[PDB]
Amino acid sequence: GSSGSSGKNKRGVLPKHATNVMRSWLFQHIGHPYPTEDEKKQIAAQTNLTLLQVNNWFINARRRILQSGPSSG
């Protein structure tokens, strides 16, 4: 029974190595930032993160780029 969602580290930070992989991917699919069941599996390894992490990071990331675009600041 995989678990992780429960509880959210009030403060968390990932290494540049992890942000690198995810970043590259996000940019490659900037239009549609949606990781595939596989991407989450493969990436998790390259970044050494858990399916949960890779997801959380993306969810938060996509949000940043999502808002920062259509809105004329």
From Swiss-Prot:
Activates transcription in the presence of PBX1A and HOXA1. Belongs to the TALE/MEIS homeobox family. It is found in: Nucleus. Changing V13I: In a colorectal cancer sample; somatic mutation. Residues 8-67 bind DNA. The chain holds residues 260 to 319 of 436 of the full protein. Interacts with MN1. The gene is PKNOX1. The lineage of its organism: Eukaryota, Metazoa, Chordata, Craniata, Vertebrata. Ubiquitous. Isoform 2 is expressed in all examined tissues except in bone marrow. This is Homeobox protein PKNOX1.
